[model samples]
Target: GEKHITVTVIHGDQTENVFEFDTDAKYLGEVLESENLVDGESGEYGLFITTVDEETADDSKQQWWCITKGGEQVNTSADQTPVSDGDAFELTLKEGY
Candidate 1:
């Protein structure tokens, strides 16, 4: 069965958008990729996400989209993160970890 979840993207300027999706994918990356909602390159880490909501990360400014589950940062990368129904994920632009 498909589970309903929400993805909220908070841009660097503090602007934000919320998108709703119903997915069967167990991993967060799978859901995002399925919707063409994010772009990134694979690194030593599995997936190094660099873009969200059509905005790319600014390496020069050390600004990147940081993924969080609920209000706290995720402990694992998106590819390894399991998501369920009623879950909410936030992608916020952050200046360096």
Candidate 2:
């Protein structure tokens, strides 16, 4: 069955973009990848997100993508993050370890 979800992206410049779509995919990475919203490679843990909305975090500055749901950090990789109807996710380009 397909489910509807919303994804909010907070770029490094503090700009925000929102995407709402319906998907039959079970994982966050699948939906994002299908829509060309995010880019990453499969890693030992799971998908390692490298870019979002055309913005790539600079590892030299410790920049990375932060995934959160309902404002709380998500512990799993996007490949493992489950999607449900009406679910809202936030991806922020954050700096630090």
Candidate 3:
């Protein structure tokens, strides 16, 4: 079977610079690179099939989960959990509060 999908990268204030990959992977980290979203690593980053998930659009943060290199999943309800393309991926962010 053939599969194709699209991924858009929004860095710093919704810059909206989108990147696409035509593959059939189960998770996003399967075919991507780790980007430092916030320089020093301390805040948050997000991803999904769409820019906004209208179906389960819960605006309270803590909407997604992150998988670790050791096959561990951590709930981002507390903060930004690291992700990886094949191992533990990460997006360095900062906390302004």
Candidate 4:
């Protein structure tokens, strides 16, 4: 079964990269990683995304990737987040903790 999803990567410089596709993947991390839209390391909690759209998070500035679904914050990690039809996700490079 194919699921359609839209992912918007918001970079630290306020630039945006949008990706829309139909995939058979079951999770958000799989879909994004397949498209080379996201990069991260696997940990005990799940995938800890370090970069999106080629923009890496800056540790010095306390910048990190924030995941949201349909404009609201997601409770699970990307690898744990299920993917369904018409899902819209935002990966924002957020500053601070």
Candidate 5:
């Protein structure tokens, strides 16, 4: 069965877009990579996401991508995170806490 998911990409700009996907992808990262929603290097930890929608995270500047699911934050990395039916997540650019 095909599942649906909602993904929103947030940049420093005052605008964003909500993308809808219906697929059988096992991981959230798959859908994102397939749609070109994000780009980065993969390390031992998993997807070391550095950029989202053209906004690259500058480690020296303490900027990075923050991920949340269904309005709450989760600990699992996107590559290791499994996607079930009707999962919604957001990728926002955030600095240090």
Candidate 6:
């Protein structure tokens, strides 16, 4: 039942972020690293979860998603969240919206 979904990459700036990915990432961290949005060594940034769309936007399934799951961040080392087509993954700042 998995189908293509719209993965809208956004930030706290309220601007459209155009990030091209070579391959679909299972986690938001992968997309960040893929799009070169990470400043790892500098520790200048951190990924934050804004929204996650599992089904239709009105399905109310996307309302219960965090950049982390079970109170944790999912990165390559812990890539537990998998994205699919038609799913819009939103982003924000670590502090807040």
Which prediction has more favorable lDDT, 4 or 5? 4
lDDT of 6 by residue, 62-87 (tens): 33223432334545221434665544
- Against the hidden reference, what TM-scores do the models get? 0.94, 0.96, 0.32, 0.95, 0.90, 0.38
Error of 2 at 26 (Å): 0.7
Candidate 3 regions off by >4 Å? 34-97
Q: C-alpha displacement of 40 in model 6, angstroms?
A: 5.6
- Candidate 6 minimal-lDDT segment of 10 residues: 51-60
Q: Model 5, 75: alpha-carbon shift in Å?
A: 1.0
Worst 10 residues of 3 by lDDT: 49-58
Determine which window of 10 residues in candidate 4 has minimal summed lDDT. 9-18
Residue runs of model 5 more than 4 Å from their true location after superposition: none
Q: Write the number of the candidate with greater TM-score, choosing between 3 and 4.
A: 4
* Pairs that clash in candidate 4: none
lDDT of 2 by residue, 1-37 (tens): 9899999999999999999979999999998988899
* By lDDT: ranked, best first: 2, 4, 1, 5, 6, 3
Model 2 misses residue 86 by how many Å? 0.7
lDDT of 5 by residue, 1-97 (tens): 6889898887766467788999899988998888788997888878888888778888987888888898788687888777888888888888888
Structural RMSD, model 3 = 11.7
Give the distance in Å from residue 33's predicted Cα in candidate 2 to where it truly belongs.
Answer: 0.5
Best by lDDT: 2
As a whole number from 0 to 100, the lDDT of residue 40 in candidate 2 is: 91
lDDT of 1 at 10: 94
Candidate 4 local Cα displacement, residue 93, angstroms: 0.3
- Please give, for residues 1-97, the per-residue lDDT of candidate 1 as tens digits: 7999999999888888998999999999999999899998887877888999898889998987788988887988889989899999999888976
* Candidate with the greatest TM-score versus the true structure: 2
